[PDB]
Amino acid sequence: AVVKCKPTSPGRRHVVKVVNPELHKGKPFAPLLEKNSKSGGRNNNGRITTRHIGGGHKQAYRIVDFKRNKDGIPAVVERLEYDPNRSANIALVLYKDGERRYILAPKGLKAGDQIQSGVDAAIKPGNTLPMRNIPVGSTVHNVEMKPGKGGQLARSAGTYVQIVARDGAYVTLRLRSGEMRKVEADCRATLGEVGNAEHMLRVLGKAGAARWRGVRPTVRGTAMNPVDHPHGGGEGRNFGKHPVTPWGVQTKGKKTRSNKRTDKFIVRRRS
Amino acid sequence: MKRTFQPSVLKRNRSHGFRARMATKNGRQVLARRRAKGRARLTVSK
RNA sequence: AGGACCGAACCGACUAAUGUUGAAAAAUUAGCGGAUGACUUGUGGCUGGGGGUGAAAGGCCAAUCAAACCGGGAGAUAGCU
RNA sequence: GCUCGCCGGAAGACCAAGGGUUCCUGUCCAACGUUAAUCGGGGCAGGGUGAGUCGACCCCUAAGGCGAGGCCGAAAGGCGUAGUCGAUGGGAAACAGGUUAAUAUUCCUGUACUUGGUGUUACUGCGAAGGGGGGACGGAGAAGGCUAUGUUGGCCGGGCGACGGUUGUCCCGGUUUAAGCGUGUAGGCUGGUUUUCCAGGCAAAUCCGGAAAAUCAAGGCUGAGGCGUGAUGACGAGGCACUACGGUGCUGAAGCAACAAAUGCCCUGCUUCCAGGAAAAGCCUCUAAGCAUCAGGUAACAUCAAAUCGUACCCCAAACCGACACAGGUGGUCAGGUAGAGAAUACCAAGGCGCUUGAGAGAACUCGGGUGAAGGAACUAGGCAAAAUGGUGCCGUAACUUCGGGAGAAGGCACGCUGAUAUGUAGGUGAGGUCCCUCGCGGAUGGAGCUGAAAUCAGUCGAAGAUACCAGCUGGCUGCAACUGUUUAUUAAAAACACAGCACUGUGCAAACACGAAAGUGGACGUAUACGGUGUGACGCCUGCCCGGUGCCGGAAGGUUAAUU
RNA sequence: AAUUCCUUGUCGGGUAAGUUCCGACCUGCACGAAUGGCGUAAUGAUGGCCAGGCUGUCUCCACCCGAGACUCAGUGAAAUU
Fold it and tell me: Residue A243 sits in a domain of what CATH number?
């Protein structure tokens, strides 16, 4: 649920929290944990390649099964756990053969629900099937770009993909961005949407909240100096030039897609 | 007032030690120059 | 519960005086700010000069920074002293 | 040697880092020491550092480094796999007393403990570069049970007072004892046991996971402290013989109880929150290939081994970093008494110091302070500085407001000591006794003893009772920025930067983008409720008109237009 | 007006006296709506202004306690020329 903090002090006045009582209030599944060392936005050369990254709370990676290749073995949802590595929640599912795995939690999933994967699986939320068997017009998530590569599209808190048409060996999808893209009609997809739709309603409320996420402060650019940024300085605030990134690219409408290997699978771009 | 030099033997050897100099071609050139000059102490090893 | 309150340690450096061949190449004394946090600190590691890093002052990068230091081109050139 | 003064959350004590003989003894005083010097961290000589248990080494790994082949690159070289290094982290074991001029958990005495090798005896499924478990982990908060430790009483030894009193409800000192072993308590967690089956754990598995039955309710694990033992010992205030008045043999009393109590321990617990909180080995199990009248495994006993290096001394400082015996800087551990909320503050204990020129004088002027007639900001760019306010309880408290605040608003009253209520109350603690019980570190009852606020009434001293140190000046209007934060180390702390929020725009993943001749890496083990860039800057009401210019995004007819031909 | 040159604009408030400050006026030299406009409780070692208290800030300095200054003994610099 969405709850607004009382203004007992500055920094809590505008805080809006998303509290889920159904989430597991305990330690995660140790066998599926892994070490996740922070990088600070620096590559193997030691240089900052992506700015505004650093600090934040320590996190342990959860091995989420994006492939869902366990076919024909029913699984039962044990509990839903908070995942610090992604906006969406995850569910610990116990297969009937005694195996436990982590999967993205769909919208209407809760403890005790039954899920299955394979060609013969039922058309219910949480089930993963190849898009060939998925009825046209269905809502799916964790879509696979290539057969067997694992889900890659629509994995955010409340995102989903709609199957628009099936033309032979390909199916046309409408992504959350509005793009119309086609993929082979053999990729796996999970029914339903991701069930953390309230995630977008949270309000951090204070600067320190962003620092917890590991986001370092952003310096605008119009106020540093001519040497550091094209927007430069000037006596007072001038900014008398076209908006531009560092390194000199416009970025106020200028497009930067230059793949040319894809775009055979792109029907419409967006908007 | 904290000053520039804060001694630490481990860091001293790792930065300017004999093995560190031998680890790279440029470092080996430093030893060659010092040997040619006749330096009594090649590095800060001890 | 809180980038909550008062206030030591701890971290800061707003005012004044002194000092200015100083006790000190930036400190002392009396007050002053934060003091569970975007906090602070030990050890080790990584980023190298038209480059790094920068909650952005052209700040900082060994008391040196609008392009560090050392060696070399080099006895640069100097219609100027 | 006797006084005086200073620090005492250190200006005491013990370490790391760093230094490297500054340690101890003898000797010397040229130089060094801001003076003298017989003295010294100075010169010279000699002597000092003793470990199976402390640390390193060693086993294990983090960030990261290196990196066989490999990929990439004019060369140099870059990146990286298998691997191998890398603590600031994980991993076996020793305590008390005594002792040296200088070392000790290292030597000595006493009493322990750990991991290995080998041997004998008995019983035996052993086996990993594999599987599983464990190791293994956040913030905040709340108590409860304890100890370190302190106070008082009791007990033991001593004392009877330089000046009135002091044989008593008087004064001084002591009242200490470890690891280990045994007990398994306050308290924390988890339902046990047995049988059958199984698409799971790269193969297997009796192990882990999963499923289905039956049977019992008591099983197990973890766990401070206490108690017993260790200990007929050691230590012990003070005696008695030696006694070069430097110090040794021997002997040596009491050695209990109550209360208070941690920031330390139970607690890697419990509760709760979102920002969701290392790895690997040792360790415990599981089997595979293999080996089975063997080898190995378990247990008992015996025996042997536990090497090597560090160990002096300083370590908030005269020994480290600052050229100095320099008002500087420097991480961890220990934490006594009275008052106090307190690690503030004042005075003290243990302990350590008076800071390496002094002696006089008592001018101007400067510095650091005390007081002040009358006036009270007339000073000045400006209340700069100074003065002032200052505590606890109770009463009381405005506009405005985002309903939290504003607020400790403002303002007012009471504070000492003595006695009584009450020979010390409410409360806390809790012995003896009685009873019960699965006869235990148990439960109930019981209230001795000890500890002990706060309040009321009465009395009483002073000019003054929050008397010292300590310890908010307050109120009114207004600009700017929402706020906490950040910044020119060394003249600028701000209205500047960040900021949550908002918007535009790019980005379908081999993403955009960035670092790289490249490989590759970051973005991200993320996937449009995501990520990058740009502007604005909480919140509230809002964000109007203009696309000619420049930019960006589309367009398809025509014109012009490179290499090439 | 952090923006107004003329300028100490004009009027009112506050003062015995107000180039500052506060409230209005609009003749905006040369405000203006995300290089955001206008408000805004709270916050601020932030800018301006006014009060109560307070005082050696001052009228106007006086005395006193310490460290120097001064004298004696020892040691023994510096810039400049």
Answer: 4.10.950.10
| CA atoms in the 13 A half-sphere facing the CB of A109 | 33
d(CA A225, CA A231): 8
The set of strand D positions with any atom below 7 Å of a protein CB reads 17-19, 62-66, 76-77, 79-80, 87, 132-134, 136-137, 198-201, 209-210, 273-279, 320-322, 328-330, 402-404, 482-484, 496-501, 504-516, 520-523, 525-539, 550-554
Alpha helices in A99-242 (DSSP H): 207-212
Task: Give the determination technique.
Answer: cryo-EM
- Is A29 in contact with A94 (CB distance < 8 Å)? no
Chosen domain end from A113, A148, A173? A113
Q: For B1-46, give the CATH class.
A: mainly alpha
